[PDB]
């Protein structure tokens, strides 16, 4: 249904500054607010947002309130200043999936059909992209409850924009691993990539924590993919993999050989262009 | 004028059939196959335009130009309430989907005739399309003993008498039905059969090794079924190319499927932890 | 016999009969020798 | 006559197609022709290289095999070599003469 | 049960383990490939079939031991192959 989401740096900071402006509460407050934007060509977009006044008590943590008058007036001001901009869903600050974040979506689903939530990060650290979005799916199914509803994570990324990149690259001024050559991919995905595979190997190990000791439901819907992985582990080295592999390596290194074969001659020509700049300058000038 | 000029100009094509002249018949029918958006009172007239279009498509080999012809004589709003004359309309709507040549138009045409409530009132002809839908067919002699007899039976005998009665066009339907049943073997034989002997296949076609080579020949020079036969060891095989690049190529395909697959579980585990170890 | 022993030629002698058979060894390309014939010269050509 | 050569060979590529090997005695039967002129004519196919394969004299098994070889990769890198050799020959004309 | 080393059974082995004759096991497995529980190719002349994909079943707390162990040294192959990347690819980018 929904392919993926588009998140901007403007909404990205536009949550964090609100976490700063309610950061004086000290004890506990989650930044929940209203997520604005479009979705076009089956691609979710997030352009604007604001935050709603919200409080919560730990005793009886099934009670939430959104001042929907404040939702009406300010979004009326936002449709007014920008008729193109509209609602796209909501968000909460999302450390660890708080429990009112099952009906916050069912509370305000009367505005957006796919009333999407976004989990953000307040203390930014990972080896990946700490931006999360779920989606609401419900099920009269299998065996958990006759009324069952659990969010499912749609893939999430930071959408860029030509307007905002002036501010992005303007406000970086720190470091930027450009000069995309033979080593950009080496570090963005060959150094960072295998350590990308590290945590994905680690998460199935975190599920493996229930061999006899973990939570009481066992598998049901985990083990078809698990059997599928070790079923679909790739082909071993006995056939033409090493052959045709040696064939195609044995063809790629031809092109490498030609490129290195030119490059030396080019730089040699350049040195001759220097010795003309030396020998007929030493006698001329002195 | 919408009706009377059309009634005038569709007359003389059967006169061209009395000439045995199809090259004129299709040109003067080219005037009227673009004559539509008049389906209000013309009950029998467009049906006469179709029944003078049974033969222009019936004569030479055109067993797939009769597709929209025969569903077009399923189309007409009168036919629905003359059930036994509509039973032979259930006949003509099935006596071509076999008979049409192998096509994507045939392979979704089985779905265009499939999923019908009032066609499956004949208990045989849901099974007939079921046979060419599903897996391996019971040769030909184990088939004609089960279905070469119901063509005389039922309330449906008349386009089956267009299969029976003419022994020459009818014989072309014995050998085109025979073409579909001898071909229906060869499709899934090439699909699942890596390397089979020649005698085993001539035995599963119930005929000679020589005529079996005639069957495999005109399809591999049609190159619609690629095969590398043998006439010294009888060891034939299907879809056996040299494959320099598809080994590592499809291996890379297995890599991408694998990385998608290991990506599939990773975002699925974390919510499974958070539904019993949330709070 | 020592031409077999020291490397050079591989295949067998029917010492009883007397013919020395030799097998047809082709496709030395997918045998990874010319990758080494490259990599000797890849590295050196980068060096020059 | 010349049309009969192309028709003869049109049949001759037609029946030879679906297999890898056969004896000459079956293709002589299947085109309904002799074996000597068919053997010589098949030899002329693999002399003129219009058809390629091999033939046998012991019983006449025609071994048919085809793959399109990699050609673009090596020679197109090979003529760049003889370009650049001439370029180094020109480097005499600005390098050896000059400094 | 057969590992991914071979998983290549023969029609004599089906004729032993299912005691059904030589001329019906192919009609059995064409039906099996039509249904789609198993995914493998059929050779007739070497009397063997190359079965590749099996329908996934369920399992107790004992198969997770073997899947855990085949996972465990598969971690350190990623550690080991990555270690050359960190060591040799150290000076390309600090």
From Swiss-Prot, chain A:
Organism superkingdom: Eukaryota
PROSITE patterns from the UniProt entry: MPN (PS50249)
UniProt keyword annotations, A-Z: Acetylation, Isopeptide bond, Proteasome, Ubl conjugation
InterPro entries the record matches: EIF3F/CSN6-like_C, JAMM/MPN+_dom, MPN, MPN_RPN7_8
Molecular function as annotated in GO: protein homodimerization activity
Coiled-coil stretches: none
GO CC, one annotated term: membrane
Glycyl lysine isopeptide (Lys-Gly) (interchain with G-Cter in ubiquitin) crosslink location in chain: 176
PTM-bearing positions, type N6-acetyllysine: 200, 210
MPN domain ranges (all copies): 5-140
GO biological process: proteasome-mediated ubiquitin-dependent protein catabolic process
Keyword Acetylation recorded: yes
CDD domains: MPN_RPN7_8 (cd08062)
Family: Belongs to the peptidase M67A family.
Note: Does not bind a metal ion.
Physiological role: Component of the 26S proteasome, a multiprotein complex involved in the ATP-dependent degradation of ubiquitinated proteins. This complex plays a key role in the maintenance of protein homeostasis by removing misfolded or damaged proteins, which could impair cellular functions, and by removing proteins whose functions are no longer required. Therefore, the proteasome participates in numerous cellular processes, including cell cycle progression, apoptosis, or DNA damage repair.
Quaternary data: Component of the 19S proteasome regulatory particle complex. The 26S proteasome consists of a 20S core particle (CP) and two 19S regulatory subunits (RP). The regulatory particle is made of a lid composed of 9 subunits including PSMD7, a base containing 6 ATPases and few additional components. Within the complex, PSMD7 interacts with subunit PSMD4 through their respective MPN domain. Interacts with TRIM5.
The species this protein was found in: Homo sapiens (Human)
From Swiss-Prot, chain C:
Domain of life assignment: Eukaryota
Task of the protein: Component of the 26S proteasome, a multiprotein complex involved in the ATP-dependent degradation of ubiquitinated proteins. This complex plays a key role in the maintenance of protein homeostasis by removing misfolded or damaged proteins, which could impair cellular functions, and by removing proteins whose functions are no longer required. Therefore, the proteasome participates in numerous cellular processes, including cell cycle progression, apoptosis, or DNA damage repair.
Homology family: Belongs to the proteasome subunit S3 family.
Quaternary structure and interacting proteins, as annotated: Component of the 19S proteasome regulatory particle complex. The 26S proteasome consists of a 20S core particle (CP) and two 19S regulatory subunits (RP). The regulatory particle is made of a lid composed of 9 subunits including PSMD3, a base containing 6 ATPases and few additional components. Interacts with UBQLN1 (via ubiquitin-like domain). Interacts with ERCC6.
Name of the protein this chain belongs to: 26S proteasome non-ATPase regulatory subunit 3
Organism of this sequence: Homo sapiens (Human)
Upper lineage: Eukaryota, Metazoa, Chordata, Craniata, Vertebrata
Gene label: PSMD3
Curated annotation (Swiss-Prot), chain D:
Highest taxon above the source species: Eukaryota
Subunit annotation: Component of the 19S proteasome regulatory particle complex. The 26S proteasome consists of a 20S core particle (CP) and two 19S regulatory subunits (RP). The regulatory particle is made of a lid composed of 9 subunits including PSMD11, a base containing 6 ATPases and few additional components.
Annotated family: Belongs to the proteasome subunit S9 family.
Tissues in which the UniProt entry reports expression: Highly expressed in embryonic stem cells (ESCs). Expression decreases as ESCs differentiate.
Induction remark: By FOXO4; expression in embryonic stem cells (ESCs) is mediated by FOXO4.
Compartmental location: Nucleus; Cytoplasm, Cytosol
Listed name of the protein: 26S proteasome non-ATPase regulatory subunit 11
Known role: Component of the 26S proteasome, a multiprotein complex involved in the ATP-dependent degradation of ubiquitinated proteins. This complex plays a key role in the maintenance of protein homeostasis by removing misfolded or damaged proteins, which could impair cellular functions, and by removing proteins whose functions are no longer required. Therefore, the proteasome participates in numerous cellular processes, including cell cycle progression, apoptosis, or DNA damage repair. In the complex, PSMD11 is required for proteasome assembly.
Record-annotated membrane-spanning stretches: none
From-to range in the entire protein, with total length: 324 to 422 of 422
PTM comment, free text: Phosphorylated by AMPK.
Curated annotation (Swiss-Prot), chain E:
Modified residues (N6-acetyllysine): 16
Subunit structure: Component of the 19S proteasome regulatory particle complex. The 26S proteasome consists of a 20S core particle (CP) and two 19S regulatory subunits (RP). The regulatory particle is made of a lid composed of 9 subunits including PSMD13, a base containing 6 ATPases and few additional components.
Function as written in the Swiss-Prot or TrEMBL entry: Component of the 26S proteasome, a multiprotein complex involved in the ATP-dependent degradation of ubiquitinated proteins. This complex plays a key role in the maintenance of protein homeostasis by removing misfolded or damaged proteins, which could impair cellular functions, and by removing proteins whose functions are no longer required. Therefore, the proteasome participates in numerous cellular processes, including cell cycle progression, apoptosis, or DNA damage repair.
Family: Belongs to the proteasome subunit S11 family.
Designated name of the protein: 26S proteasome non-ATPase regulatory subunit 13
Upper classification of the organism: Eukaryota, Metazoa, Chordata, Craniata, Vertebrata
Part of the intact protein present: 283 to 376 of 376
């Amino acid at each position: 249904a929904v392919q993926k989401v588009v998140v901007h740096p403007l909404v990205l900071l536009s949550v964090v500054d609100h976490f700063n402006r309610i950061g004086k509460v000290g004890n506990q407050k989650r930044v929940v607010g209203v997520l604005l934007g479009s979705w076009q060509k089956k691609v979710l977009d997030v352009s604007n947002s604001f935050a709603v006044p919200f409080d919560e008590d730990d005793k009886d943590d099934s009670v939430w309130f959104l001042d929907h008058d404040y939702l009406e007036n300010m979004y009326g001001m936002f449709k007014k200043v920008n008729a193109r901009e509209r609602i796209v869903g909501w968000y909460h600050t999302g450390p660890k999936l708080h429990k009112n974040d099952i009906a916050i979506n069912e509370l305000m689903k009367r505005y957006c059909p796919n009333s999407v939530l976004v989990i953000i990060d307040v203390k930014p650290k990972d080896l990946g992209l700490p931006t999360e979005a779920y989606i609401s799916v419900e099920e009269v199914h299998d065996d958990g409850t006759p009324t069952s509803k659990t969010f499912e994570h749609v893939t999430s990324e930071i959408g860029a924009e030509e307007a905002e990149e002036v501010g992005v690259e303007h406000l970086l001024r720190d470091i930027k691993d450009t000069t995309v050559g033979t080593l950009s991919q080496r570090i963005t995905n060959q150094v960072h990539g295998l350590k990308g595979l590290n945590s994905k190997l680690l998460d199935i190990r975190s599920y493996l924590e229930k061999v006899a000791t973990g939570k009481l439901p066992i598998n049901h819907q985990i083990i078809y993919q698990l059997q599928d992985v070790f079923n679909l582990l790739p082909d071993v080295s006995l056939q033409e993999f090493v052959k045709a592999f040696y064939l195609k390596t044995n063809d790629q290194m031809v092109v490498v050989y030609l490129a290195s074969l030119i490059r030396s001659v080019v730089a040699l020509h350049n040195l001759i262009n220097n010795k003309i700049a030396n020998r007929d300058a030493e006698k001329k000038e002195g | 004028e919408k009706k009377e000029r059309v009634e005038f100009i569709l007359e003389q094509m059967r006169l061209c059939l009395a000439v045995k002249d199809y090259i004129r018949t299709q040109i003067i029918s080219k005037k009227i196959n673009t004559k539509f958006f008049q389906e209000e009172n013309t009950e029998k007239l467009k049906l006469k335009y179709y029944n003078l279009m049974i033969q222009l498509d019936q004569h030479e080999g055109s067993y797939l130009s009769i597709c929209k012809h025969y569903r077009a004589i399923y189309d007409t709003p009168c036919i629905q309430a003359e059930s036994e004359k509509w039973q032979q309309a259930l006949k003509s709507v099935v006596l071509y989907v076999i008979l049409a040549p192998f096509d994507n138009e045939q392979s979704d045409l089985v779905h265009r005739i499939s999923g019908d409530k009032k066609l499956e009132e004949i208990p045989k002809y849901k099974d007939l399309l079921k046979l060419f839908t599903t897996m391996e067919l019971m040769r030909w002699s184990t088939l004609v003993e089960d279905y070469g007899m119901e063509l005389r039976k039922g309330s449906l005998e008349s386009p089956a008498t267009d299969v029976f009665g003419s022994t020459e066009e009818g014989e072309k339907r014995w050998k085109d039905l025979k073409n579909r049943v001898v071909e229906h073997n060869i499709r899934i034989m090439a699909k699942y059969y890596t390397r089979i002997t020649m005698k085993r296949m001539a035995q599963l076609l119930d005929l000679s090794v020589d005529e079996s080579e005639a069957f495999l020949s005109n399809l591999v020079v049609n190159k619609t079924i690629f095969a590398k036969v043998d006439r010294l060891a009888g060891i034939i095989n299907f879809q056996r190319p040299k494959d320099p690049n598809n080994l590592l190529n499809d291996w890379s395909q297995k890599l991408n499927s694998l990385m998608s697959l290991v990506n599939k579980t990773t975002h699925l585990i974390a919510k499974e932890e958070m539904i019993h170890n949330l709070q | 016999a020592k031409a077999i022993r020291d490397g050079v030629i591989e295949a067998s002698i029917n010492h009883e009969k007397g013919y020395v058979q030799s097998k047809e060894m082709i496709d030395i390309y997918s045998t990874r020798e010319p990758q080494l014939a490259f990599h000797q010269r890849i590295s050196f050509c980068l060096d020059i | 006559a010349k049309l009969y050569d192309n028709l003869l060979e049109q049949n001759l590529i037609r029946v030879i197609e679906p297999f890898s090997r056969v004896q000459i005695e079956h293709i002589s039967s299947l085109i309904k022709l002799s074996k000597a002129d068919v053997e010589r004519k098949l030899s002329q196919m693999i002399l003129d290289k219009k058809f390629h394969g091999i033939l046998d004299q012991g019983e006449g098994v025609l071994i048919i095999f085809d793959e399109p070889p990699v050609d673009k990769t090596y020679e197109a890198a090979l003529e760049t070599i003889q370009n650049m050799s001439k370029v180094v020959d020109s480097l005499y004309n600005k390098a050896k003469k000059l400094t | 049960t057969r590992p991914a080393n071979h998983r290549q059974l023969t029609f004599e082995e089906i004729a032993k383990s299912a005691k059904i004759t030589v001329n019906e096991v192919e009609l059995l497995v064409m039906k099996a490939l039509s249904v789609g529980l198993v995914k493998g190719s059929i050779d007739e002349v070497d009397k063997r079939v190359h079965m590749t994909w099996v329908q996934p079943r369920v399992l107790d707390l004992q198969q997770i031991k073997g899947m855990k162990d085949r996972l465990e040294f598969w971690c350190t192959d990623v550690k080991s192959m990555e270690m050359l990347v960190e060591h040799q690819a150290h000076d390309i980018l600090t």
